[PDB]
Design a protein around this ligand. Structure first.
Ligand SMILES: Cc1cc2nc3c(=O)[nH]c(=O)nc-3n(C[C@H](O)[C@H](O)[C@H](O)COP(=O)(O)OP(=O)(O)OC[C@H]3O[C@@H](n4cnc5c(N)ncnc54)[C@H](O)[C@@H]3O)c2cc1C
Ligand SMILES: *[C@@H]1O[C@H](CO)[C@@H](O[C@@H]2O[C@H](CO)[C@@H](O)[C@H](O)[C@H]2NC(C)=O)[C@H](O)[C@H]1NC(C)=O
Ligand SMILES: *[C@@H]1O[C@H](CO)[C@@H](O)[C@H](O)[C@H]1NC(C)=O
Ligand SMILES: *[C@@H]1O[C@H](CO)[C@@H](O)[C@H](O)[C@H]1NC(C)=O
Ligand SMILES: *[C@@H]1O[C@H](CO)[C@@H](O)[C@H](O)[C@H]1NC(C)=O
Ligand SMILES: *[C@@H]1O[C@H](CO)[C@@H](O)[C@H](O)[C@H]1NC(C)=O
Ligand SMILES: *[C@@H]1O[C@H](CO)[C@@H](O)[C@H](O)[C@H]1NC(C)=O
Ligand SMILES: CC1(C)OCc2cc(C=O)ccc2O1
Length: 512
């Protein structure tokens, strides 16, 4: 595990403005998106080869509130001016959401929770994983940026509560996704400093790795034996740039669940009928690009204790097969953190509150990503998740919401009631309190938010082979959250950080 230490920006010595035309030319690898998977991938490939990492966002030093636990709410509260580290969007379902626009990607804006994948996930995928390597790669990430969190009074309350509510066994401190109650790792250190995927660039070879920031990759370039050969990207002034791969090199798309399918569709990789209807020339027909896009539901209640509670970052997890629960305690605010609540018309708290949540696993419900613009990558694509279109997800939210009921009934939570009455109506609620089964179904459907753990759109077995290659195209891979249809665990940053380096190692091995 990592120590308490300042955020390591040493890698800025090889970070350049995309306006610099001397970045243009040939590389062994081009990685698109300096995010959760993309940074460790680029750092790994740079051990042996010349790598260009292209990131549309700027550097995290420009937005200091990204570098502390205390800053979490600020980045969501801040207006999206097209330059900010948080990009706001609204799914076609009507649910407010965010994605990262910064070097380090969503690890620079997220809630810091670190877990390893459910050990059953690997065999469920049917990919021939090198499981020893997976574990060495987890340790490489964890050594760099993960800590054992210190005690936080709210998280200890919630852990006592989960155990009293029957979420057993007590797993103590563990990074593993396993049934029961545990303290998990965090990418916020014990001084509250955020550590993130951008610090994994410090593991790259500074003679081999170049990073362009404010680089908007607009198109993947192909050969006239179809190969990816390069990219077109534009800089912050709007001028265009080209970079290419050479010899046995490859372009990897690491632009996230939203950005990867968007760039593939803009490049003519996607469903023939759909692309044809936009007069986009088809380079590689594939009916599944931007299909099987998922967003795990977040359902929640908010309690307002009659005495102040101390704000906390989530470290204590309550895990069952059918639901994953946590709680954060928060200061009040008069500017809402965008997407914490599903719409902007949610009532504001004006005292300290506990946000107590359950996450639907999978989920089984899915939607898609489609282009809004057929040319401009800076225009966000359309995204729809179809929350609770699958009855199994609704069934699982019902079970989760019943367990949050059990949690509000524990001795652990009894001190946070406004009235010493027998029932959970003894709490004061911000928004809709918990309510047979139909009332819980209505509550699940009506009060859903994003968990922010959206995934899919470029699935292994649909768009990619078991080596993350785009089927039908040489020298093109995708490595990020677009790649799997089901969550590897409650909190997937750990899996995607691991995946970046792991796939980089598989690329270096395939080539040796
Ligand atoms: C608010 C929030 C809180 C979360 N909290 C947690 C948590 O506590 N723990 C946890 O495990 N998970 C959490 N998650 C989820 C997790 O952080 C993400 O699922 C994961 O980081 C996604 O990694 P990725 O590489 O797929 O995408 P990203 O990390 O978003 O990386 C993609 C990168 O590509 C860039 N990009 C996009 N398109 C282009 C383009 N055309 N050209 C150039 N660059 C481009 C983006 O700017 C971005 O930097 C959270 C998510 C959010 C939004
Ligand atoms: C870890 O993932 C595994 C496999 O995806 C889950 O085990 C499955 O769970 C369902 C519901 O309990 C069972 O009906 C399946 O048959 C199980 N499959 C296998 C291969 O064991 C497990 O639930 C996940 N664990 C947690 C705690 O989320
Ligand atoms: C890149 O250069 C332009 C000036 O041409 C400037 O406006 C922009 O802020 C720079 N971006 C970064 C990330 O330095
Ligand atoms: C990988 O580490 C996990 C704990 O995260 C352990 O359960 C598992 O047995 C390890 N697998 C191998 C192949 O060593
Ligand atoms: C595609 O181009 C043809 C002209 O070849 C035109 O008839 C049609 O409307 C165009 N469709 C779109 C959506 O641009
Ligand atoms: C683009 O997104 C807007 C939201 O601004 C949506 O309402 C509009 O219909 C979209 N256009 C296309 C072509 O998808
Ligand atoms: C839900 O998902 C399962 C697994 O994909 C699928 O078998 C089924 O068709 C879906 N169920 C409903 C209610 O649509
Ligand atoms: C569980 C979850 C979403 O984690 C993070 C979080 C942060 C805040 C502060 O704005 C408030 C509530 C909250 O809850």
């Amino acid at each position: 595990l990592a120590n308490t230490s300042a955020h390591d920006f040493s890698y800025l010595k090889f970070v350049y403005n995309a306006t610099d035309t001397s970045l243009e030319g040939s590389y062994d690898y081009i990685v698109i998106g300096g995010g959760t998977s993309g940074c460790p991938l680029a750092a790994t490939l740079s051990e042996k080869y010349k790598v260009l990492l292209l990131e549309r966002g700027t550097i995290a030093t420009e937005y200091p509130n990204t570098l502390t636990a205390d800053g979490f709410a600020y980045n969501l509260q801040q207006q999206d001016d097209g330059k900010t580290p948080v990009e706001r969007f609204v799914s076609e379902d009507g649910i407010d959401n965010v994605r990262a626009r910064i070097l380090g990607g969503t690890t620079i804006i997220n809630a810091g929770v670190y877990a390893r994948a459910n050990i059953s996930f690997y065999s469920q995928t049917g990919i021939e994983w090198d499981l020893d390597l997976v574990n060495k790669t987890y340790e490489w990430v964890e050594d760099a940026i993960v800590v054992k969190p210190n005690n936080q009074s709210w998280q200890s309350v919630i852990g006592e509560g989960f155990l009293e509510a029957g979420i057993l066994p007590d797993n103590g401190f563990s990074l593993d996704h396993e049934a029961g109650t545990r303290l998990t790792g965090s990418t916020f250190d014990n001084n509250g400093t955020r550590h993130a995927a951008d610090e994994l660039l410090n593991k790259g070879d500074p003679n081999n790795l170049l990073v362009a920031v404010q680089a908007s990759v607009e198109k993947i370039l192909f050969s006239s034996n179809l190969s990816a050969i390069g990219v077109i990207y534009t800089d912050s002034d709007g001028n265009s740039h080209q970079a290419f791969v050479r010899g046995n090199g490859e372009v990897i798309v690491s632009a996230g669940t939203i950005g990867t399918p968007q760039l593939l569709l803009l490049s003519g990789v996607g469903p023939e009928s759909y692309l044809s209807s936009l007069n986009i020339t088809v380079v590689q027909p594939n009916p599944y690009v931007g299909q099987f896009v998922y967003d795990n539901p977040r359902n929640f209640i908010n309690i307002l204790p009659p005495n102040p509670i101390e704000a906390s970052v989530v470290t204590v997890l309550g895990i069952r097969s059918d639901y994953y629960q946590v709680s954060a305690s928060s200061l009040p605010f008069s500017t809402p953190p965008f997407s914490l609540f599903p719409t902007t018309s949610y009532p504001l708290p004006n005292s300290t509150f506990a946000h107590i949540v359950s996450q639907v696993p999978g989920p089984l419900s899915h939607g898609s990503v489609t282009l809004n613009s057929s040319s401009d990558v800076r225009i966000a694509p359309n995204i729809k998740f179809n929350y609770y279109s699958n009855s199994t997800d609704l069934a699982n939210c019902v079970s989760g919401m019943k367990k949050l009921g059990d949690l509000l009934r524990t001795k652990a939570l009894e001190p946070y009631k406004a009235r010493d009455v027998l029932g959970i109506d003894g709490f004061n609620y911000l928004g809709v309190p918990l309510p047979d089964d139909a009332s819980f179904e209505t509550f699940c459907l009506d009060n859903v938010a994003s968990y922010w753990h959206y995934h899919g759109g470029s699935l292994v077995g649909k768009v990619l082979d078991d080596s993350f290659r785009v089927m039908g195209i040489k020298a093109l891979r995708v490595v990020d959250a677009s790649t799997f249809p089901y969550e590897p665990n409650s909190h997937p940053q750990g899996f995607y950080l691991m995946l970046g380096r792991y796939v980089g190692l598989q690329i270096l091995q395939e080539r040796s």
